[PDB]
Enzyme design. Structure first.
Site, PDB file in Angstrom:
ATOM      1  N   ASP A   1       0.813  -1.208   0.000  1.00 16.49           N
ATOM      2  CA  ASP A   1       0.000   0.000   0.000  1.00 16.49           C
ATOM      3  C   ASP A   1       0.849   1.260   0.000  1.00 16.49           C
ATOM      4  OD1 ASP A   1      -2.968   0.888   0.416  1.00 16.49           O
ATOM      5  OD2 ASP A   1      -1.738   2.193   1.711  1.00 16.49           O
TER       6      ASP A   1
ATOM      7  N   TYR B   1       3.753   9.611  -0.160  1.00 18.34           N
ATOM      8  CA  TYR B   1       4.791   8.962   0.644  1.00 18.34           C
ATOM      9  C   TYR B   1       6.204   9.196   0.112  1.00 18.34           C
ATOM     10  CZ  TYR B   1       0.640   6.551   2.444  1.00 18.34           C
ATOM     11  OH  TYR B   1      -0.603   6.293   2.980  1.00 18.34           O
TER      12      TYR B   1
ATOM     13  N   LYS C   1      -1.956   6.016  -4.647  1.00 20.26           N
ATOM     14  CA  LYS C   1      -2.985   7.014  -4.376  1.00 20.26           C
ATOM     15  C   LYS C   1      -2.765   8.386  -5.032  1.00 20.26           C
ATOM     16  CE  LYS C   1      -3.397   4.820   0.240  1.00 20.26           C
ATOM     17  NZ  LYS C   1      -1.987   4.514   0.620  1.00 20.26           N
TER      18      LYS C   1
ATOM     19  N   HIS D   1      -6.844   9.684  -2.774  1.00 13.10           N
ATOM     20  CA  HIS D   1      -6.298   9.784  -1.427  1.00 13.10           C
ATOM     21  C   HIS D   1      -7.191  10.567  -0.476  1.00 13.10           C
ATOM     22  CE1 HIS D   1      -2.059   9.613   0.628  1.00 13.10           C
ATOM     23  NE2 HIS D   1      -3.025   9.203   1.435  1.00 13.10           N
TER      24      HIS D   1
ATOM     25  N   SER E   1     -10.448   6.872  -0.668  1.00 11.78           N
ATOM     26  CA  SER E   1      -9.889   6.816   0.675  1.00 11.78           C
ATOM     27  C   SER E   1     -10.346   8.046   1.463  1.00 11.78           C
ATOM     28  CB  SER E   1      -8.359   6.786   0.593  1.00 11.78           C
ATOM     29  OG  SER E   1      -7.783   6.570   1.865  1.00 11.78           O
TER      30      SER E   1
ATOM     31  N   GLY F   1      -4.097   2.179  15.989  1.00 17.22           N
ATOM     32  CA  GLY F   1      -4.516   3.470  16.493  1.00 17.22           C
ATOM     33  C   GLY F   1      -3.515   4.606  16.545  1.00 17.22           C
TER      34      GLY F   1
ATOM     35  N   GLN G   1      -0.526   4.684  17.763  1.00 16.54           N
ATOM     36  CA  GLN G   1       0.863   4.280  17.634  1.00 16.54           C
ATOM     37  C   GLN G   1       1.525   4.967  16.467  1.00 16.54           C
ATOM     38  OE1 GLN G   1       4.077   3.147  19.048  1.00 16.54           O
ATOM     39  NE2 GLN G   1       2.360   2.057  19.998  1.00 16.54           N
TER      40      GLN G   1
ATOM     41  N   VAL H   1       2.165   8.594  17.194  1.00 16.73           N
ATOM     42  CA  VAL H   1       3.024   8.857  18.336  1.00 16.73           C
ATOM     43  C   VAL H   1       4.427   9.000  17.748  1.00 16.73           C
ATOM     44  CG1 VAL H   1       4.264   7.700  20.208  1.00 16.73           C
ATOM     45  CG2 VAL H   1       1.769   7.738  20.228  1.00 16.73           C
TER      46      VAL H   1
ATOM     47  N   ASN I   1       7.869  -2.661  10.655  1.00 10.41           N
ATOM     48  CA  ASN I   1       9.153  -1.976  10.623  1.00 10.41           C
ATOM     49  C   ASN I   1      10.248  -2.748  11.354  1.00 10.41           C
ATOM     50  OD1 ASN I   1       7.970  -1.547  13.156  1.00 10.41           O
ATOM     51  ND2 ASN I   1       8.991   0.434  13.405  1.00 10.41           N
TER      52      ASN I   1
ATOM     53  N   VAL J   1       6.643 -11.089  10.325  1.00  9.67           N
ATOM     54  CA  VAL J   1       5.993 -12.376  10.536  1.00  9.67           C
ATOM     55  C   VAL J   1       4.712 -12.264  11.352  1.00  9.67           C
ATOM     56  CG1 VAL J   1       6.203 -14.662  11.542  1.00  9.67           C
ATOM     57  CG2 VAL J   1       8.149 -13.652  10.358  1.00  9.67           C
ATOM     58  N   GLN J   2       4.814 -11.663  12.533  1.00 11.01           N
ATOM     59  CA  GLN J   2       3.659 -11.500  13.409  1.00 11.01           C
ATOM     60  C   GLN J   2       2.456 -10.934  12.659  1.00 11.01           C
ATOM     61  OE1 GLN J   2       5.910  -8.964  16.354  1.00 11.01           O
ATOM     62  NE2 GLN J   2       5.248 -10.473  17.879  1.00 11.01           N
TER      63      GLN J   2
HETATM   64  N1  LIG Z   1      -4.942   6.479   2.911  1.00 13.14           N
HETATM   65  C1  LIG Z   1      -4.598   7.035   4.038  1.00 13.14           C
HETATM   66  O1  LIG Z   1      -5.030   8.102   4.393  1.00 13.14           O
HETATM   67  C2  LIG Z   1      -3.625   6.353   4.987  1.00 13.14           C
HETATM   68  C3  LIG Z   1      -3.268   7.000   6.250  1.00 13.14           C
HETATM   69  C4  LIG Z   1      -2.363   6.316   7.113  1.00 13.14           C
HETATM   70  C5  LIG Z   1      -1.812   5.046   6.763  1.00 13.14           C
HETATM   71  N2  LIG Z   1      -2.200   4.475   5.507  1.00 13.14           N
HETATM   72  C6  LIG Z   1      -1.591   3.154   5.112  1.00 13.14           C
HETATM   73  O2  LIG Z   1      -1.848   2.102   6.113  1.00 13.14           O
HETATM   74  C7  LIG Z   1      -0.588   1.652   6.686  1.00 13.14           C
HETATM   75  C8  LIG Z   1      -0.609   1.348   8.159  1.00 13.14           C
HETATM   76  O3  LIG Z   1      -1.038   2.498   8.907  1.00 13.14           O
HETATM   77  P1  LIG Z   1      -0.029   3.191   9.904  1.00 13.14           P
HETATM   78  O4  LIG Z   1       0.972   3.881   9.096  1.00 13.14           O
HETATM   79  O5  LIG Z   1      -0.745   4.017  10.890  1.00 13.14           O
HETATM   80  O6  LIG Z   1       0.646   1.984  10.722  1.00 13.14           O
HETATM   81  P2  LIG Z   1       0.085   0.859  11.713  1.00 13.14           P
HETATM   82  O7  LIG Z   1      -0.945   1.423  12.491  1.00 13.14           O
HETATM   83  O8  LIG Z   1      -0.032  -0.370  10.854  1.00 13.14           O
HETATM   84  O9  LIG Z   1       1.362   0.580  12.654  1.00 13.14           O
HETATM   85  C9  LIG Z   1       1.833   1.687  13.428  1.00 13.14           C
HETATM   86  C10 LIG Z   1       3.102   1.336  14.264  1.00 13.14           C
HETATM   87  O10 LIG Z   1       2.980   0.246  15.297  1.00 13.14           O
HETATM   88  C11 LIG Z   1       4.161  -0.539  15.324  1.00 13.14           C
HETATM   89  N3  LIG Z   1       3.806  -1.912  15.050  1.00 13.14           N
HETATM   90  C12 LIG Z   1       3.496  -2.573  13.887  1.00 13.14           C
HETATM   91  N4  LIG Z   1       3.305  -3.872  14.037  1.00 13.14           N
HETATM   92  C13 LIG Z   1       3.503  -4.062  15.402  1.00 13.14           C
HETATM   93  C14 LIG Z   1       3.436  -5.239  16.176  1.00 13.14           C
HETATM   94  N5  LIG Z   1       3.158  -6.487  15.741  1.00 13.14           N
HETATM   95  N6  LIG Z   1       3.690  -5.108  17.557  1.00 13.14           N
HETATM   96  C15 LIG Z   1       3.991  -3.857  18.128  1.00 13.14           C
HETATM   97  N7  LIG Z   1       4.061  -2.693  17.387  1.00 13.14           N
HETATM   98  C16 LIG Z   1       3.807  -2.845  16.026  1.00 13.14           C
HETATM   99  C17 LIG Z   1       5.207   0.119  14.398  1.00 13.14           C
HETATM  100  O11 LIG Z   1       6.175   0.811  15.176  1.00 13.14           O
HETATM  101  C18 LIG Z   1       4.412   1.021  13.477  1.00 13.14           C
HETATM  102  O12 LIG Z   1       5.100   2.198  13.112  1.00 13.14           O
HETATM  103  C19 LIG Z   1       0.484   2.649   6.133  1.00 13.14           C
HETATM  104  O13 LIG Z   1       1.790   2.088   5.972  1.00 13.14           O
HETATM  105  C20 LIG Z   1      -0.139   3.171   4.845  1.00 13.14           C
HETATM  106  O14 LIG Z   1       0.158   2.392   3.697  1.00 13.14           O
HETATM  107  C21 LIG Z   1      -3.098   5.118   4.625  1.00 13.14           C
END
Ligand SMILES: NC(=O)c1ccc[n+]([C@@H]2O[C@H](COP(=O)([O-])OP(=O)(O)OC[C@H]3O[C@@H](n4cnc5c(N)ncnc54)[C@H](O)[C@@H]3O)[C@@H](O)[C@H]2O)c1
Ligand SMILES: NC(=O)c1ccc[n+]([C@@H]2O[C@H](COP(=O)([O-])OP(=O)(O)OC[C@H]3O[C@@H](n4cnc5c(N)ncnc54)[C@H](O)[C@@H]3O)[C@@H](O)[C@H]2O)c1
Lengths: 319, 319
Positions: A44, A49, A78, A111, A166, A218, A220, A223, A273, A279-280
């Site tokens: 995605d 980006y 997007k 977008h 979106s 959420g 995260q 932050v 990241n 994997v998880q």
């Molecule tokens: N269209 C839009 O407006 C829009 C906006 C935001 C994000 N997105 C997309 O959706 C994706 C995900 O959203 P996001 O960016 O908020 O990230 P997310 O919510 O998927 O993850 C946020 C954070 O949590 C941590 N994390 C991830 N997996 C974890 C795990 N198993 N255990 C503990 N911590 C973990 C990482 O540090 C990461 O930076 C983006 O990469 C992007 O492609 C789209």
């Protein structure tokens, strides 16, 4: 192992993907390459980006070693806000295709239902919040349907397999459906325990529109951006409700937050990241949430939104 | 005296009006007439209220006795949901004009951003939730902008002085402003301490769109309809916050609920079913709420909506 979802367009889309927001350009390729080795097939990305070129290098490398073929990779991009004017849609899509190094994208989404004033690509790319007049935000009168039609033309031309939107609220999606020939195949929105918007989900899914959730963890994500709102918000990882449920099935709170969306037919694009996280984030469909579980997580809904154009310049998207 | 509000269209609109919803057909005439005698000059009506003919009789009598001139009466009407399709807009406005017995309406609003299937006046009028297939809902694929364009024409034809919308969320209003030549002059939405939508008001106003609030007494009007949601909501007239404030200035809860909106540039159209309430509902601008008062009332906003198409047929207007 990673379930597919048949979109309204007839094409398949993996229910579990790899997010590319805040994916540093320096290692984006290496990381995209690794993601592929780990099984991820959907990526995605987005023009905003500013890493579609590196994301491309990653995909190309994997193809060149013979690990996958173009048709096995599902690429989502997007259209940024500055390119809503019909006469500039293809132009931006071309840049995306050029950076990704492909003949087409699998999914191209509007977008934001916001139309910034056009900034030539040569002047600045990606434009971000730049609207051609210093720090001032400037908009152009381009109704959403005009943009959607340009997108439909691009689908007939074979440059895009499926199109969607979106950050669209229920009333805007309904009005787009009244004038769309090819109906949006996907609706990508912020979806998590603190912002469930159950009615929007119900409408879209009932309308034959596939939901893809972003920011499944959420606050995260924000932050890590040092945002005041997200920092003041208790993490879902350490929330009593999520933890309890996670302990009942002997899973991690992270696996719970993703399963909570996946079980209801919603697609996810977690941001992995860390190697362990790769994997998880794609091995959580090993248990089932009961009606009781959903009711408990349901209580966390307070309509808290982290990605809000209202913070940018008071754009009434969600008001 | 009742201060006026200059609409973006250039025409002045009284900041206080007489609501016509649920105004009985047998007495509608006499009631409108009495309100005119009492000073009301604006009347918020609608094709769906099924009483514009009687509302017309009322105003006609006032004029015939030399009480007022047509130029002194502000008549608002609303295009019901079955008349969105452009070829039907004119006919519906026509039936309204004949019913009201006038050549033009001071203001015409798209009652709802929902397009029901067409049902001929003769088959049933007003259609209500009737679509032509029993108790089933049937919709037409007609984008808002199409209906809006139809209205703009009608203005150029002198059959409408000003146009606007009603029950339009933020995103929707924004998109319409993108394809509109004549910007919506007014936005009429449910508005009271339990549903304050402060950002919506802010956005609309900063855009020159005038706000007209309805159901200013919260759950009140829908209680007089035995609506479940409204009957399980503590009345605003008994709420401790409103009581305290009313006692402070020695005013009625009703007067406080209307000033709350009025002091903020929002127009009101209370429904007055009592000669005394008729007078009070237009004589509440004799005091000002303090900054502290607005802060205490602000805490009431829980976003409780009593008029929701979601209840009709799960129509996603507010999600
Ligand atoms: N269209 C839009 O407006 C829009 C906006 C935001 C994000 N997105 C997309 O959706 C994706 C995900 O959203 P996001 O960016 O908020 O990230 P997310 O919510 O998927 O993850 C946020 C954070 O949590 C941590 N994390 C991830 N997996 C974890 C795990 N198993 N255990 C503990 N911590 C973990 C990482 O540090 C990461 O930076 C983006 O990469 C992007 O492609 C789209
Ligand atoms: N566009 C729309 O969707 C829409 C929807 C609803 C109403 N409206 C309009 O707005 C108007 C007002 O809304 P409403 O009719 O729901 O109700 P309201 O808020 O005007 O008043 C509701 C009820 O409270 C009582 N009331 C009135 N004045 C009072 C006073 N001084 N003290 C104590 N009680 C008092 C009456 O019994 C009345 O029926 C309507 O007449 C109609 O024209 C528009």
């Amino acid at each position: 192992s990673i379930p597919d979802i048949k979109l309204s367009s007839g094409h398949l889309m993996p229910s579990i993907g790899f997010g590319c927001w805040k994916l540093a350009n320096a290692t984006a390729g290496e990381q995209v390459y690794q993601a592929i080795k780990a099984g991820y097939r959907l990526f995605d990305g987005a023009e905003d980006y500013g890493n579609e070129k590196e994301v491309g290098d990653g995909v190309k490398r994997a193809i060149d070693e013979g690990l996958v073929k173009r048709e096995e990779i599902f690429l989502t991009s997007k259209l940024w806000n500055n390119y809503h004017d019909p006469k500039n849609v293809e132009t931006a899509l071309n840049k995306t295709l050029a950076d990704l190094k492909v003949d087409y994208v699998d999914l191209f989404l509007i977008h934001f239902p916001i139309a910034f004033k056009f900034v030539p690509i040569e002047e600045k790319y990606p434009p971000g919040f730049y609207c051609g007049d210093g720090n001032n935000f400037v908009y152009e009168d381009v109704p959403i349907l005009e943009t959607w039609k340009a997108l439909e033309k691009l689908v007939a031309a074979g440059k895009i397999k499926s199109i969607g939107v979106s950050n669209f609220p229920g009333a805007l999606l309904l009005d787009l459906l009244r004038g769309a020939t090819i109906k949006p195949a996907v609706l990508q929105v912020e979806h998590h325990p603190y912002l469930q918007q159950p009615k929007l989900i119900e409408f879209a899914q009932k309308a034959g529109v596939t939901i893809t959730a972003y920011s499944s963890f959420g606050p995260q994500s924000f932050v890590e951006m040092n945002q005041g709102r997200a920092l003041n918000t208790p993490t879902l990882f350490a929330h009593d409700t999520i933890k309890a449920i996670a302990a009942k099935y002997n899973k991690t709170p992270a696996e719970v937050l993703l399963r909570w969306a996946a079980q209801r037919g919603i697609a996810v694009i977690p941001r992995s990241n860390l190697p362990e996280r790769l994997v998880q984030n794609r091995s959580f469909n090993t248990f089932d949430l009961t009606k009781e579980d959903f009711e408990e997580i349901a209580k966390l809904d307070i309509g808290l939104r982290f990605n809000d154009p209202w913070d940018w310049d008071n754009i009434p998207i969600f008001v």
